[PDB]
Amino acid sequence: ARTVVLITGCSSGIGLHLAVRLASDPSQSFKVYATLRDLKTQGRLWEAARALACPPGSLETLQLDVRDSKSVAAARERVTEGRVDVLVCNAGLGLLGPLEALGEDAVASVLDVNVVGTVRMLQAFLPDMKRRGSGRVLVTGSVGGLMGLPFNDVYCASKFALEGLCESLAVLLLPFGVHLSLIECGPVHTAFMEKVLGSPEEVLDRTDIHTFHRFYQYLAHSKQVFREAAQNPEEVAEVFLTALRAPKPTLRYFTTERFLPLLRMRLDDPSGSNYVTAMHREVF
Amino acid sequence: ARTVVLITGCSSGIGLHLAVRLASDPSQSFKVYATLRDLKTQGRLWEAARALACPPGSLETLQLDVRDSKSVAAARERVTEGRVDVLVCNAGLGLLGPLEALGEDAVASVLDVNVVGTVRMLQAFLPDMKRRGSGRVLVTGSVGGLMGLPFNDVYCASKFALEGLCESLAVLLLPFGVHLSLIECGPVHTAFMEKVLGSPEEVLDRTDIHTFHRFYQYLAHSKQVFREAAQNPEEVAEVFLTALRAPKPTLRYFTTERFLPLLRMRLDDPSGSNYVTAMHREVF
Numbered sequence: 207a208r209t210v211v212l213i214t215g216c217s218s219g220i221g222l223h224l225a226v227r228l229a230s231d232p233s234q235s236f237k238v239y240a241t242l243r244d245l246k247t248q249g250r251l252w253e254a255a256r257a258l259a260c261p262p263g264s265l266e267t268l269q270l271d272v273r274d275s276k277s278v279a280a281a282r283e284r285v286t287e288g289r290v291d292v293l294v295c296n297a298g299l300g301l302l303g304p305l306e307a308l309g310e311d312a313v314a315s316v317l318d319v320n321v322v323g324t325v326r327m328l329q330a331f332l333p334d335m336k337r338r339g340s341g342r343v344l345v346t347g348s349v350g351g352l353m354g355l356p357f358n359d360v361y362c363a364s365k366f367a368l369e370g371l372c373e374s375l376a377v378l379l380l381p382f383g384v385h386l387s388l389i390e391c392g393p394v395h396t397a398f399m400e401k402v403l404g405s406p407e408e409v410l411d412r413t414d415i416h417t418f419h420r421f422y423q424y425l426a427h428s429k430q431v432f433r434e435a436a437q438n439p440e441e442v443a444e445v446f447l448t449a450l451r452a453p454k455p456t457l458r459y460f461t462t463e464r465f466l467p468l469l470r471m472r473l474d475d476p477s478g479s480n481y482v483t484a485m486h487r488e489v490f
Numbered sequence: 491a492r493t494v495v496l497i498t499g500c501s502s503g504i505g506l507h508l509a510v511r512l513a514s515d516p517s518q519s520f521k522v523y524a525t526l527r528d529l530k531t532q533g534r535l536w537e538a539a540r541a542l543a544c545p546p547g548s549l550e551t552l553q554l555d556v557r558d559s560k561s562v563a564a565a566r567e568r569v570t571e572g573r574v575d576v577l578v579c580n581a582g583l584g585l586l587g588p589l590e591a592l593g594e595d596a597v598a599s600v601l602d603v604n605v606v607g608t609v610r611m612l613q614a615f616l617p618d619m620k621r622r623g624s625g626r627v628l629v630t631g632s633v634g635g636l637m638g639l640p641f642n643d644v645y646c647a648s649k650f651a652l653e654g655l656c657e658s659l660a661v662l663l664l665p666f667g668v669h670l671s672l673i674e675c676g677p678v679h680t681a682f683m684e685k686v687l688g689s690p691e692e693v694l695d696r697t698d699i700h701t702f703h704r705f706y707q708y709l710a711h712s713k714q715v716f717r718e719a720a721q722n723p724e725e726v727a728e729v730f731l732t733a734l735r736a737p738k739p740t741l742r743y744f745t746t747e748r749f750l751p752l753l754r755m756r757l758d759d760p761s762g763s764n765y766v767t768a769m770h771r772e773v774f
């Protein structure tokens with residue numbers, strides 16, 4: 207039994223690099239359980255693990271589908287240590303395009319995986335972290351949870367929710383000695399954006415010409431803004447570590463300092479109209 | 491034909507008061523379409539209608555439950571005027587209790603009804619609104635959407651979600667000529683909130699003695715604040731009018747100023763920890 211860490215969505219991006227960063231730590235103090243929605247996807251994980259010579263006994267891959275309470279509790283009973291000190295809610299789905307262009311199923315999944323799942327992860331672990339009176343939880347934050355971005359309604363929705371689920375919980379947990387931290391990310395080189403963008407071409411068939419133009423117009427800005435500050439998933443894991451070490455973690459950590467002006471100004475405007483203006487005359 | 495309004499969840503409270511205040515308006519300008527999850531409950535709606543002397547034809551009820559796109563779809567094809575100049579997304583439910591004490595069917599229902607349902611509506615009316623190049627969208631806000639409240643994890647989760655859903659939409663919507671704005675309200679004279687009396691063993695047989703205690707103490711504080719801050723839908727509906735009247739309404743209307751200093755605090759702290767301290771000290 208050492209610092210037992212249970213992380214979700216370890217198949218790629220931040221969930222992978224993190225699992226291996228923690229597991230391969232030179233102070234061999236982290237015993238990580240990298241969970242995966244689907245195990246068949248644990249190749250690149252193991253490959254990296256080997257690439258770092260991440261010592262025997264530290265990383266045990268486990269399967270965990272966030273949109274399944276059955277799948278979650280079982281992956282919990284499989285924690286031989288019988289305790290989790292750090293839980294990391296990381297799984298998540300993206301969604302882009304004209305709101306009217308998405309579908310009900312699509313929308314449900316995003317909120318299903320990104321929010322409810324975070325609830326299942328919490329519901330199953332927090333109890334035990336509470337009677338114990340010690341524990342740490344980390345949730346992969348996002349800009350879209352602190353501000354609104356065009357054609358990112360449902361994702362910014364799923365991420366704004368997490369701000370809610372966490373902050374309210376953070377309150378009650380104060381005397382409980384359990385710790386909640388939202389790692390607020392920005393763009394980052396992960397499997398996340400490399401496919402979710404789908405195919406911008408089909409959109410025109412479920413929207414008006416004026417939005418479609420604006421959808422590509424956003425895409426073009428997106429792609430430029432990404433290849434300007436998309437941080438390395440390793441750089442991002444670094445923040446997860448600094449929170450972990452903090453004796454008294456804060457409600458949130460920020461991986462990039464670029465979105466902090468938009469936020470600052472945004473908070474100086476309660477009606478939210480100065481923000482909407484800026485953000486708009488920024489994307490387009 | 492005149493200002494057509496389609497209000498969702500008018501069965502009671504805010505939804506019923508705005509419906510009738512509009513229909514029975516002096517200028518007899520608004521043609522209200524009060525929508526209900528289940529038509530039976532329109533009894534109390536009509537009572538207020540009658541009471542308010544809403545002329546014949548300025549208010550016709552339709553049935554539609556935002557958790558069934560087939561329903562929503564129908565409700566729009568029932569708006570004989572061919573247009574909806576004012577769309578109001580107001581239905582939705584609350585949820586209180588220790589996160590672990592809640593059920594999945596429950597945590598789901600709230601998310602599926604407060605966000606998805608709001609999305610379904612938008613996906614239905616927003617288009618024609620855009621092609622018209624004229625529109626008005628009112629969504630019932632909340633303080634839980636602006637800040638986290640203990641034992642209100644899932645609800646504030648669903649509420650914060652509307653902040654992003656709408657805020658992001660708003661940004662795209664800027665040039666289109668349609669307007670989206672939330673009505674950030676606080677505790678009002680509504681059954682649910684003032685009728686939170688019970689705390690069954692169901693809660694007890696599903697949380698730890700430490701949380702159990704912080705649960706009731708919450709309710710006690712919550713009953714007090716309500717007894718001293720609860721706003722009756724009456725004023726709240728008055729706010730909705732204030733909004734739709736302004737040539738260019740802002741992204742956020744506040745029915746009460748009682749919480750502005752609390753969120754004011756929120757502003758000056760990126761770590762979100764000053765608040766978690768404050769709002770805990772203030773709840774417990």
Ligand SMILES: NC(=O)c1ccc[n+]([C@@H]2O[C@H](COP(=O)([O-])OP(=O)(O)OC[C@@H]3O[C@@H](n4cnc5c(N)ncnc54)[C@@H](OP(=O)(O)O)[C@H]3O)[C@H](O)[C@@H]2O)c1
Binds near residue numbers: 221272297299348399
């Ligand atoms: N970096 C980003 O742009 C970014 C921004 C803000 C926050 N974070 C967060 O961390 C996540 C991953 O982002 P990333 O950028 O690291 O890219 P990513 O490529 O999506 O990496 C994580 C993904 O989460 C998984 N996942 C998806 N659905 C799941 C389900 N039902 N159950 C369990 N796991 C599931 C993984 O497996 P599968 O491929 O098998 O689905 C996976 O690739 C979140 O979705 C979230 O947005 C990332």
Ligand SMILES: NC(=O)c1ccc[n+]([C@@H]2O[C@H](COP(=O)([O-])OP(=O)(O)OC[C@@H]3O[C@@H](n4cnc5c(N)ncnc54)[C@@H](OP(=O)(O)O)[C@H]3O)[C@H](O)[C@@H]2O)c1
Binds near residue numbers: 499503504527554557
């Ligand atoms: N006022 C509050 O404390 C408050 C605070 C912030 C924001 N708002 C927002 O607007 C709502 C209502 O608050 P209120 O204070 O007016 O009282 P309320 O009693 O909840 O009024 C609106 C209600 O939503 C309905 N609804 C429920 N499930 C539905 C479904 N599945 N499909 C369609 N409609 C459904 C109504 O019909 P049925 O009874 O037949 O279900 C109804 O009375 C939201 O839930 C939300 O919190 C209210």
Ligand SMILES: C[C@]12CC[C@H]3C(=CCc4cc(O)ccc43)[C@@H]1CCC2=O
Binds near residue numbers: 348391488489
């Ligand atoms: C929200 C986000 C960070 C911010 C980024 C994103 C989308 C659009 C966008 C637009 C901006 O003007 C500045 C930054 C970003 C990312 C999508 C995934 C993510 O975490």
